[PDB]
mmCIF file of C-alpha atoms and ligand atoms in Angstrom:
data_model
loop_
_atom_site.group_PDB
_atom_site.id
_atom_site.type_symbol
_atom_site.label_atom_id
_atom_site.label_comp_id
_atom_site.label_asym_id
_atom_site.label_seq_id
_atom_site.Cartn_x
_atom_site.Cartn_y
_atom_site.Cartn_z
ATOM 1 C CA UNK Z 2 0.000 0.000 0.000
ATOM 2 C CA UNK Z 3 1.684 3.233 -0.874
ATOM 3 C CA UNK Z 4 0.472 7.166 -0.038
ATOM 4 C CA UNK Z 5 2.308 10.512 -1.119
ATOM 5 C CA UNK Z 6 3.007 12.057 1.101
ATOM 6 C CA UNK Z 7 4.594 15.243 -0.795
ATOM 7 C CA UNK Z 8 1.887 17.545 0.109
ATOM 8 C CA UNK Z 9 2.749 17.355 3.701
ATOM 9 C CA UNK Z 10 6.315 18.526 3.130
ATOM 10 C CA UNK Z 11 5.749 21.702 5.480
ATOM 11 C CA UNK Z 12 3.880 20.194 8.132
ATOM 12 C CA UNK Z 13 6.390 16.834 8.410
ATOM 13 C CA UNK Z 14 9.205 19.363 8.466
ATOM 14 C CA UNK Z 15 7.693 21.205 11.565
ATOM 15 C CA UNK Z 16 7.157 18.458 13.185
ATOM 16 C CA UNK Z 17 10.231 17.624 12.474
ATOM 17 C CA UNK Z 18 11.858 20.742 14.060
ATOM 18 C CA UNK Z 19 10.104 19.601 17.622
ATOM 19 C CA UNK Z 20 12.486 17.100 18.181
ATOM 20 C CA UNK Z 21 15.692 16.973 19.975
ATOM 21 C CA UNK Z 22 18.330 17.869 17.770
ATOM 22 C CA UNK Z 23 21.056 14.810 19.127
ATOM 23 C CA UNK Z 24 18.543 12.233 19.339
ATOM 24 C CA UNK Z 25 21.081 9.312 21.026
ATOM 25 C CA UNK Z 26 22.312 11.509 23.768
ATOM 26 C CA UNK Z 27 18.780 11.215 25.612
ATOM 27 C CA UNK Z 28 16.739 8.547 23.159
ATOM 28 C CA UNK Z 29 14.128 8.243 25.781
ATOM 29 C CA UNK Z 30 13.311 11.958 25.756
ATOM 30 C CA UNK Z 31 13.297 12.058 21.755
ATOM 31 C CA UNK Z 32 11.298 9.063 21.128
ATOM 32 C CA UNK Z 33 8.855 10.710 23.982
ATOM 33 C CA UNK Z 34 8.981 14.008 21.904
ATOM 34 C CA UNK Z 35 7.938 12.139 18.971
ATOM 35 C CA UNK Z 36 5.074 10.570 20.250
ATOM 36 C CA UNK Z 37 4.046 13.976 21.212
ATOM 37 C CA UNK Z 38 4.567 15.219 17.787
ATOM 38 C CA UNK Z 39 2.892 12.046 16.127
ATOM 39 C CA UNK Z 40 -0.559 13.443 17.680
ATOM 40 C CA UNK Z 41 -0.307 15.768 14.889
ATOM 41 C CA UNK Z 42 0.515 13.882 11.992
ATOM 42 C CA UNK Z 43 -1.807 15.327 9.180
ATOM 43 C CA UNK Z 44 -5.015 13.581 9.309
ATOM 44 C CA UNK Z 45 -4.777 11.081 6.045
ATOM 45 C CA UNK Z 46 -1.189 10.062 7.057
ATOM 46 C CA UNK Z 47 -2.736 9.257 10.577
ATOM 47 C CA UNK Z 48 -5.418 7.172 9.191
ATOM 48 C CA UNK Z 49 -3.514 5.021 6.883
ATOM 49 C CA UNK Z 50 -0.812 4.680 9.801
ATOM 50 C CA UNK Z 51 -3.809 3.110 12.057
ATOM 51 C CA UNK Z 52 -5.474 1.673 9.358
ATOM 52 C CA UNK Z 53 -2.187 -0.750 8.736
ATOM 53 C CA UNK Z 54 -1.530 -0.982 12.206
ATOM 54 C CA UNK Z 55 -5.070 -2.498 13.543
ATOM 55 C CA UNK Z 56 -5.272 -4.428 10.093
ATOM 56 C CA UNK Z 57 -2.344 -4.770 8.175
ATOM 57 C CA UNK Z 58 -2.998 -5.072 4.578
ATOM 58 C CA UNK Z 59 -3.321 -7.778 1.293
ATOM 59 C CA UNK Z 60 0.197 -6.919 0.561
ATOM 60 C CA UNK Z 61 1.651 -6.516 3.680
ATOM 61 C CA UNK Z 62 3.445 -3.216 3.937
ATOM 62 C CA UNK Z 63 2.719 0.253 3.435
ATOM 63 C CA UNK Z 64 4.962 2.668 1.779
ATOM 64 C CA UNK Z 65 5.378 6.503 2.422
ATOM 65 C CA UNK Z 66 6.603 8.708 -0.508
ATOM 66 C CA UNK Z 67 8.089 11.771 -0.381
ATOM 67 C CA UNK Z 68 8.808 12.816 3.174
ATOM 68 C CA UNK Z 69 11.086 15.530 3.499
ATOM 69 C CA UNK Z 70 15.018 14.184 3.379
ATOM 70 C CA UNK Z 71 17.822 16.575 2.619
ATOM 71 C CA UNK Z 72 19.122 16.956 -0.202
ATOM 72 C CA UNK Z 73 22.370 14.476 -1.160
ATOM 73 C CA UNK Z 74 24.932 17.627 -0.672
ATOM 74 C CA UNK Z 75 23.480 18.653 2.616
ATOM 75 C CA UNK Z 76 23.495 14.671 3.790
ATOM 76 C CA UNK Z 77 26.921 13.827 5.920
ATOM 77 C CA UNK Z 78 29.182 10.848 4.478
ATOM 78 C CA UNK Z 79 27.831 7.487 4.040
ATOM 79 C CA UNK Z 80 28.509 5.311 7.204
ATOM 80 C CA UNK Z 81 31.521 3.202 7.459
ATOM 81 C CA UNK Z 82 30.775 1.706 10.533
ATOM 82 C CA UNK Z 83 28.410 0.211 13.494
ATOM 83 C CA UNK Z 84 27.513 1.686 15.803
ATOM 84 C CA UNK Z 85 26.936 5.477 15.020
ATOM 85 C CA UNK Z 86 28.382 8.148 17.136
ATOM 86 C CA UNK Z 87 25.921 9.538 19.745
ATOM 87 C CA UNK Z 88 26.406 12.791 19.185
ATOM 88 C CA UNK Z 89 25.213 12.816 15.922
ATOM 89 C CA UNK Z 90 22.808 15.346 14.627
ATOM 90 C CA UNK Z 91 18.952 14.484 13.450
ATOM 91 C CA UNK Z 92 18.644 13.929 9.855
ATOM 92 C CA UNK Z 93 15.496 14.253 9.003
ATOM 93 C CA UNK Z 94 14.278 10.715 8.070
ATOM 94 C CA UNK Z 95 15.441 9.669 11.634
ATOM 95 C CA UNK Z 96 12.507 12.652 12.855
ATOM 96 C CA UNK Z 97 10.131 10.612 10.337
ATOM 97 C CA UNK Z 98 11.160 7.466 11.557
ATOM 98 C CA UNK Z 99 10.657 8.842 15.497
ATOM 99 C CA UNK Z 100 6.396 10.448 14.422
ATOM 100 C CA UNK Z 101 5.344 7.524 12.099
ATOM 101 C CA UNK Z 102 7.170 4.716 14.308
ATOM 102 C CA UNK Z 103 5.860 6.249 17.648
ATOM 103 C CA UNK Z 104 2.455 6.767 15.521
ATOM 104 C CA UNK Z 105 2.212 2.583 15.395
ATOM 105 C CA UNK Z 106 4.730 1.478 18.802
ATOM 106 C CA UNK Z 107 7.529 1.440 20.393
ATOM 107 C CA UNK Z 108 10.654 1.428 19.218
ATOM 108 C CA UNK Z 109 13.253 -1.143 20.386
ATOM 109 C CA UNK Z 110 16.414 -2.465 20.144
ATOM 110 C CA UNK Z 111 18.111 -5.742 20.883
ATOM 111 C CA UNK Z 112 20.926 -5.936 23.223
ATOM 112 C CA UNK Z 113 23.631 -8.738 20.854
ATOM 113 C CA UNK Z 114 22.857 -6.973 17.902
ATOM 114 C CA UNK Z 115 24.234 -3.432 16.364
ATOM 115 C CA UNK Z 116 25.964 -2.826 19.872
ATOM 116 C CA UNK Z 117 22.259 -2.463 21.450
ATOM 117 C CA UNK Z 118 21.365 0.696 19.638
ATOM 118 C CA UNK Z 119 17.750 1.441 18.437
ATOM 119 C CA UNK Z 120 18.924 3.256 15.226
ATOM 120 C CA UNK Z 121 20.825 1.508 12.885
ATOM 121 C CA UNK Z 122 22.318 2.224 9.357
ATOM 122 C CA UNK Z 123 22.323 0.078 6.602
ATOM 123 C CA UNK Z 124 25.292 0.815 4.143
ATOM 124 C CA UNK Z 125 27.132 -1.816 2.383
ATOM 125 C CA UNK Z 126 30.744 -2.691 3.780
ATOM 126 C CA UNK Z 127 33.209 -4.610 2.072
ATOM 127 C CA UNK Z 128 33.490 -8.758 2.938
ATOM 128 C CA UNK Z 129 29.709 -8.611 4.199
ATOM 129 C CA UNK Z 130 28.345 -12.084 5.663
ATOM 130 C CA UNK Z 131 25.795 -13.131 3.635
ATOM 131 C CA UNK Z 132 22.617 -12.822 5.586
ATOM 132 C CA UNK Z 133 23.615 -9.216 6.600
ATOM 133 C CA UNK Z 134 22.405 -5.823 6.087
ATOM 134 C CA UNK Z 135 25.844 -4.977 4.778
ATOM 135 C CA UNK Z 136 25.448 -6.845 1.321
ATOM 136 C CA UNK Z 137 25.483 -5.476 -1.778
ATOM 137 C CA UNK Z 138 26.595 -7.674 -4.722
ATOM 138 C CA UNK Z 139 24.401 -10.865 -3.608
ATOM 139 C CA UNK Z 140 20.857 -11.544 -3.052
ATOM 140 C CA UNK Z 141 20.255 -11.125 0.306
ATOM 141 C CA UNK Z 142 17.295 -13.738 0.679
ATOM 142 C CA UNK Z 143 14.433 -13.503 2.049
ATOM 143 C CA UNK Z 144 13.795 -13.175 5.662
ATOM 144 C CA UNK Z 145 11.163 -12.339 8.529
ATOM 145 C CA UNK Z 146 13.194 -10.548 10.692
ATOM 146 C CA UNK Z 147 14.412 -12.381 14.194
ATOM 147 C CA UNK Z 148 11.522 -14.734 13.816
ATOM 148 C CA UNK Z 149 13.232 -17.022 15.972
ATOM 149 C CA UNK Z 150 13.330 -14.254 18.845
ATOM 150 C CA UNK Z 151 10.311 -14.294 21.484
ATOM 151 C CA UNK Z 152 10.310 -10.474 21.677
ATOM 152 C CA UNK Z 153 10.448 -10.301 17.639
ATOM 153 C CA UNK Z 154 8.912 -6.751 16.385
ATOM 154 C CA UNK Z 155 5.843 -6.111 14.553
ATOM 155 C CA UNK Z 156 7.153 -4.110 12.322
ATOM 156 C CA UNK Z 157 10.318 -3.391 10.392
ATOM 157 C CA UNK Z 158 10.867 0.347 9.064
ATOM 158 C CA UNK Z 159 13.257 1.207 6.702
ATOM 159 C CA UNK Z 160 13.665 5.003 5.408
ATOM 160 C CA UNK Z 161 15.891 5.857 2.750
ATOM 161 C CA UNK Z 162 18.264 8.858 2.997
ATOM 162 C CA UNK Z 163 20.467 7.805 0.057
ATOM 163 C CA UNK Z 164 19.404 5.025 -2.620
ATOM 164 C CA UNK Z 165 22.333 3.091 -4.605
ATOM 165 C CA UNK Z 166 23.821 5.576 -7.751
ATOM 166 C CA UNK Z 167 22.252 3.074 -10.093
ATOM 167 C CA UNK Z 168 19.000 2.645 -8.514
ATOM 168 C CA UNK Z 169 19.260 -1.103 -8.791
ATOM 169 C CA UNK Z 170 18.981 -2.182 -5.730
ATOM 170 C CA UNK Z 171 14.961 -3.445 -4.852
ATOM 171 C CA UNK Z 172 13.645 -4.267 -1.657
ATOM 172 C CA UNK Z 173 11.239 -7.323 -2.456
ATOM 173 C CA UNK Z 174 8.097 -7.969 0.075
ATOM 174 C CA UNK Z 175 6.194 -11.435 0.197
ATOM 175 C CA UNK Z 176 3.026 -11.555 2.014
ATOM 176 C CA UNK Z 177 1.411 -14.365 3.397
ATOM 177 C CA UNK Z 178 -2.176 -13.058 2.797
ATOM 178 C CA UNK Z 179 -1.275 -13.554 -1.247
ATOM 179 C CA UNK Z 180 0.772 -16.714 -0.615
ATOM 180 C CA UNK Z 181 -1.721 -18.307 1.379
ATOM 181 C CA UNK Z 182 -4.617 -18.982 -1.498
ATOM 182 C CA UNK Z 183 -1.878 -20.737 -3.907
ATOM 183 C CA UNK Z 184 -1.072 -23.549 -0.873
ATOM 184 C CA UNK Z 185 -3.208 -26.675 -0.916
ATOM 185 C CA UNK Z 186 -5.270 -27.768 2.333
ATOM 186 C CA UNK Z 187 -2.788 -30.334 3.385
ATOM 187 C CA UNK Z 188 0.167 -28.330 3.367
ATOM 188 C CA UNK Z 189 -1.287 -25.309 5.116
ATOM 189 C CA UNK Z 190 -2.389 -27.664 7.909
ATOM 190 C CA UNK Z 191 0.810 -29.506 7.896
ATOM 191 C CA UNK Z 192 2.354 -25.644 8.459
ATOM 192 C CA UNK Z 193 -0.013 -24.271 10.881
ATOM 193 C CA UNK Z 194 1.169 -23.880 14.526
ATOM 194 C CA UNK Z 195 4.300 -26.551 13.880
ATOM 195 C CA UNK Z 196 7.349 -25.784 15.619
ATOM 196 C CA UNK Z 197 10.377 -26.087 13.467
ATOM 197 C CA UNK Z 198 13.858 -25.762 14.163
ATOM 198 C CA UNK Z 199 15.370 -22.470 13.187
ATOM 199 C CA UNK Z 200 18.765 -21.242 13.427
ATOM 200 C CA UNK Z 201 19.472 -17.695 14.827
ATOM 201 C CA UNK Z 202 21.596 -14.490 12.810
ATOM 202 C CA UNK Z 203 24.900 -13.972 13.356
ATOM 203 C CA UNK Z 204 24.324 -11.510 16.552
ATOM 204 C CA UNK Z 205 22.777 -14.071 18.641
ATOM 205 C CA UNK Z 206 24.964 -16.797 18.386
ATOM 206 C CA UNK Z 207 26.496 -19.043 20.837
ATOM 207 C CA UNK Z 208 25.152 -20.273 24.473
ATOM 208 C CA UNK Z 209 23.480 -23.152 22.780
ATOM 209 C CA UNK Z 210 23.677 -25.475 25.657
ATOM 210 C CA UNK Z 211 22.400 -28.971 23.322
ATOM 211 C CA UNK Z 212 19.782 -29.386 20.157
ATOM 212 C CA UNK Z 213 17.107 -28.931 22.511
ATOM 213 C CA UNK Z 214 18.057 -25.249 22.633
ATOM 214 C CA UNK Z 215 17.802 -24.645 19.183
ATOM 215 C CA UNK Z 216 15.537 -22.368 18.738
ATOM 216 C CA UNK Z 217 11.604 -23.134 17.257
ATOM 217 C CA UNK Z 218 9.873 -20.983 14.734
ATOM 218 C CA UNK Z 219 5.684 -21.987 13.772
ATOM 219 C CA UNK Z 220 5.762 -21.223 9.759
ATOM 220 C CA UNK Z 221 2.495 -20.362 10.067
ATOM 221 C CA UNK Z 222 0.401 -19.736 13.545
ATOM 222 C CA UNK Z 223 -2.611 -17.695 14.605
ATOM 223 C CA UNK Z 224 -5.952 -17.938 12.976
ATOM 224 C CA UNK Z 225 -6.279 -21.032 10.349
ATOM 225 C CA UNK Z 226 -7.982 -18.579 8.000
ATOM 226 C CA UNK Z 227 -5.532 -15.210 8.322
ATOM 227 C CA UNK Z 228 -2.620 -16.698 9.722
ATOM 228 C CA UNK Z 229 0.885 -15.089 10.644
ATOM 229 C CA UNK Z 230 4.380 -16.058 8.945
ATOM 230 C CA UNK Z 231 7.683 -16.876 10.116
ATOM 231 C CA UNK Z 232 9.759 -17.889 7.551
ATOM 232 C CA UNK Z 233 13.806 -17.473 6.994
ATOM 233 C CA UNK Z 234 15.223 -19.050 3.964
ATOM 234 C CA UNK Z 235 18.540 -19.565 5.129
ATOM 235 C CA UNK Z 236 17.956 -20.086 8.813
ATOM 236 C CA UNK Z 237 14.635 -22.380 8.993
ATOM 237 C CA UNK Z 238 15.853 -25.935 8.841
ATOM 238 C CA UNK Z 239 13.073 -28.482 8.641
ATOM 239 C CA UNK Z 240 13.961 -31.878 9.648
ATOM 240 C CA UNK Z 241 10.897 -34.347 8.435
ATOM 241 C CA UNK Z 242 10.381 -35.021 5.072
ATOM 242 C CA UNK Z 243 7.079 -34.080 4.889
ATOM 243 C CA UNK Z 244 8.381 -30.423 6.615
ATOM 244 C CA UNK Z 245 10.459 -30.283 4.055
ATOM 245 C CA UNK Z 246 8.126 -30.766 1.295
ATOM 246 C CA UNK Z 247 5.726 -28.051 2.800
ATOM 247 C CA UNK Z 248 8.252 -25.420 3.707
ATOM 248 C CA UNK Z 249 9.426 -25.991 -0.282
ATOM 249 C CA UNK Z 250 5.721 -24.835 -1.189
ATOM 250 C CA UNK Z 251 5.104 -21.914 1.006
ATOM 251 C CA UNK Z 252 8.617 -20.704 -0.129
ATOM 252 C CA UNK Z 253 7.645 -21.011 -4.220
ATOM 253 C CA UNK Z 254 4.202 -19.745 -3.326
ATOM 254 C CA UNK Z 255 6.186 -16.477 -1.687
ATOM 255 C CA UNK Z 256 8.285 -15.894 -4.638
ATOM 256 C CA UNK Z 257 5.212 -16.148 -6.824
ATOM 257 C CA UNK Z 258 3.729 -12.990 -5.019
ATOM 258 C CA UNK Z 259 6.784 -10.973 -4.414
ATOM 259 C CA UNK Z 260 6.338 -7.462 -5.043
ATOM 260 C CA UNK Z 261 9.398 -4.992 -5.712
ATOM 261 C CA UNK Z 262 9.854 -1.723 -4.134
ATOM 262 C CA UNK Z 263 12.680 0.433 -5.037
ATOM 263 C CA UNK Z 264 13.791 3.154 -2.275
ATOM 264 C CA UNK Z 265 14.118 6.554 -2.795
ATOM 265 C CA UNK Z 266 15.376 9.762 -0.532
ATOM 266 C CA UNK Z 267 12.350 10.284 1.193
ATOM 267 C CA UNK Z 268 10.692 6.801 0.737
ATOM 268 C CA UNK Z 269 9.774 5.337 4.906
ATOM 269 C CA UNK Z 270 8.828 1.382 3.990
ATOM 270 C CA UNK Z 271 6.534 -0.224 6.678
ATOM 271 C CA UNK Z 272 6.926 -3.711 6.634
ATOM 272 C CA UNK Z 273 4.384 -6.299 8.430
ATOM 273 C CA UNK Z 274 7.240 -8.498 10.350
ATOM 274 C CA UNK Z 275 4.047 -10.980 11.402
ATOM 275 C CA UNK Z 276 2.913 -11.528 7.438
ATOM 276 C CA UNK Z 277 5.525 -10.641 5.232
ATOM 277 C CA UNK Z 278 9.085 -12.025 4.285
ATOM 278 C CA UNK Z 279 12.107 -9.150 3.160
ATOM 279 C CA UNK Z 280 14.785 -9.426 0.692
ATOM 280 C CA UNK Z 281 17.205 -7.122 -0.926
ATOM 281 C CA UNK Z 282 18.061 -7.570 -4.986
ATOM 282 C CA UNK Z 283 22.244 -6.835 -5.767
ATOM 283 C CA UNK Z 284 23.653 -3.785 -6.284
ATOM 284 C CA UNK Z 285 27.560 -2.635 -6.793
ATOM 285 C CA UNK Z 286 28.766 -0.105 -4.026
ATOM 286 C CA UNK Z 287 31.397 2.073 -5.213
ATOM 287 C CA UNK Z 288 33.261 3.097 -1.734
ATOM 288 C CA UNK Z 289 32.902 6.981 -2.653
ATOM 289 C CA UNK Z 290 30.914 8.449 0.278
ATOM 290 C CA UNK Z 291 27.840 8.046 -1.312
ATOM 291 C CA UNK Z 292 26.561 4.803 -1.434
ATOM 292 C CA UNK Z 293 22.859 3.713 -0.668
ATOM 293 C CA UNK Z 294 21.934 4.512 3.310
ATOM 294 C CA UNK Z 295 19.070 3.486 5.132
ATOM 295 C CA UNK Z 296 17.654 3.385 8.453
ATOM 296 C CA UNK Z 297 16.297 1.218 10.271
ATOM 297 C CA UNK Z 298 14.253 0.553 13.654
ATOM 298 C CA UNK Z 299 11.990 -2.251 15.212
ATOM 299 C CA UNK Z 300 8.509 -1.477 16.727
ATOM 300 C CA UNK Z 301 6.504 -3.433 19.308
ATOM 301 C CA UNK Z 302 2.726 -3.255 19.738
ATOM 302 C CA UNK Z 303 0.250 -4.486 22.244
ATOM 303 C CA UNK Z 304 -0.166 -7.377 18.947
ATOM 304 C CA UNK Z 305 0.339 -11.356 20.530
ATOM 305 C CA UNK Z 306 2.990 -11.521 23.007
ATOM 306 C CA UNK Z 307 5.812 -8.528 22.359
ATOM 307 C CA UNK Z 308 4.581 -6.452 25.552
ATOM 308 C CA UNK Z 309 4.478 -7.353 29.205
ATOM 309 C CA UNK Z 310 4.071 -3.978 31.216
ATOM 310 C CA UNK Z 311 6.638 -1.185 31.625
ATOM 311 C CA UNK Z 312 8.189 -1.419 28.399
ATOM 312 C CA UNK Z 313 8.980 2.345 26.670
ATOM 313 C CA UNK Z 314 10.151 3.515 22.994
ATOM 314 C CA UNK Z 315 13.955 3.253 23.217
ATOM 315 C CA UNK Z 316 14.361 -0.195 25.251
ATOM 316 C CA UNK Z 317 16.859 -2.728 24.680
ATOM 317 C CA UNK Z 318 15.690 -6.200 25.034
ATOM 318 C CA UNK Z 319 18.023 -9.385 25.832
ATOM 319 C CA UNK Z 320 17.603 -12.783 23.921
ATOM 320 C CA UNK Z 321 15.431 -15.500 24.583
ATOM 321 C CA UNK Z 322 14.652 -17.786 21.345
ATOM 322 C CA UNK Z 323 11.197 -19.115 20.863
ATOM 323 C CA UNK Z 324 10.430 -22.749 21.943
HETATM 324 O O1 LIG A 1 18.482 -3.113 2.155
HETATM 325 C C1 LIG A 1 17.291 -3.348 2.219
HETATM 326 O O2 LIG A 1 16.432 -2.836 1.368
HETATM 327 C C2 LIG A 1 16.641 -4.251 3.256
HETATM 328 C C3 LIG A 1 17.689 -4.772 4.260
HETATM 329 C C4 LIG A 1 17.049 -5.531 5.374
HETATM 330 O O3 LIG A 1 16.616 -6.709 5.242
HETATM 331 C C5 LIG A 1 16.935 -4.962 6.738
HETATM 332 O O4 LIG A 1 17.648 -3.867 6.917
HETATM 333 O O5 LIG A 1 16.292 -5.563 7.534
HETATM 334 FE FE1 LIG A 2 15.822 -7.477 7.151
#
């Protein structure tokens, strides 16, 4: 689901100006400041944010055009490295990322991963792993994100401040409300609420006391008619045969409904982590300052299970894998 927001330039760049102007230094007071701000979000932009929030959508994401970035001169340097410095300044899809994630949650981070920051940058790096952030000339497959994690997020946002110089580089979305209708009866049931094993990401590694601590992700769980996903390409690792044979036909029956979406300056992509899978199509980084930058945070909701009292946008959670 997509809406312009271009008209709103001069009202998202007020609200913009609200915030803090180091965000890090004092994250709980920005992210409190946003939520403030996100009252005020102009009226259509509010609706579709609660609209997608309460119900998701068919497609499972909605996209925000034209938000106010800077423009690529008045942008620092491309990140380098993890984790940023706190002092730095707001850019100004960080302030979006504050109003439309405080609009739907709370934003968190997780303690093993990105140093525990909230806000992270994804830049390519040279030597990347190959199920990280960080790649550029392979496929990085598709993933739910941390769906192996029992404090996995609702949503993943992603706003672009710099896209790649040849625009070839396509963030692909796979939603289980379009996969769903191509899977036959037996293999949906075979799916629904069976724990598989999964392995974790690179970040939460280690501590894994004997198999039984291998962590256990349901492909499918929730409602037998509008159920949620959990699906990792690389990490998911069936064992039966028949498993096998039914994680094989949810995964061709996601690739048949993948949609493309390619990221602008400006662009803010909303991505159902409960019904949709991610992936990232190659692109060639040229190491000049000015390769493709995006950021990214995690939001909770009151949705199945992320929330148990107390919890406030800017936490860092420790990891406990689903079993
Ligand atoms: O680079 C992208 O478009 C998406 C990367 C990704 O999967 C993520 O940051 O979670
Ligand atoms: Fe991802």
């Amino acid at each position: 689901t997509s809406v312009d927001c271009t008209a709103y330039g001069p009202e998202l760049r007020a609200l913009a100006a609200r915030l803090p102007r180091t965000p890090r230094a004092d994250l709980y007071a920005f992210l409190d400041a946003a939520h403030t701000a996100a009252a005020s979000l102009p009226g259509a932009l509010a609706t579709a944010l609660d609209t997608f929030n309460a119900e998701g959508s068919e497609d499972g994401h909605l996209l925000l055009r034209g938000l106010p970035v800077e423009a690529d001169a008045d942008l620092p340097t491309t990140p380098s490295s993890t984790p940023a410095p706190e002092d730095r300044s707001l850019l100004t899809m960080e302030a979006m990322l504050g109003l439309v994630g405080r609009r739907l949650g709370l934003h968190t981070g997780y303690r093993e991963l990105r140093s525990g920051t909230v806000y992270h940058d994804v830049y390519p790096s040279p030597g990347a792993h190959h199920l990280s952030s960080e790649t550029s000339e392979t496929l990085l497959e598709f993933h739910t994100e941390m769906a192996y994690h029992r404090l996995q997020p609702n949503y993943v946002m992603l706003a672009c401040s710099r896209a790649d110089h040849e625009r070839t580089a396509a963030t692909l979305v796979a939603s289980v409300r379009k996969a769903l209708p191509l899977l036959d009866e037996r293999t949906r049931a075979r799916l629904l609420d069976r724990r598989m094993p999964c392995c974790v990401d690179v970040a939460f590694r280690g501590g894994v006391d004997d198999p039984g601590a291998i962590a256990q992700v349901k492909p499918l769980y929730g409602d037998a008619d509008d159920p949620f996903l959990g699906y990792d390409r690389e990490l998911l690792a069936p064992e039966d045969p028949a498993d096998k044979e039914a994680v094989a036909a949810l995964s061709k029956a996601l690739d048949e409904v993948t949609e493309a979406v390619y990221l602008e300056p400006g662009d803010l992509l909303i991505v159902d982590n409960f019904r949709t899978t991610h992936a990232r199509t190659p692109f060639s980084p040229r190491w000049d300052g000015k390769d493709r930058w995006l950021h990214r945070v995690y939001i909770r909701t009151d949705r199945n299970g992320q929330l148990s009292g107390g919890e406030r946008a800017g936490d860092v959670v420790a990891f406990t894998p689903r079993g």
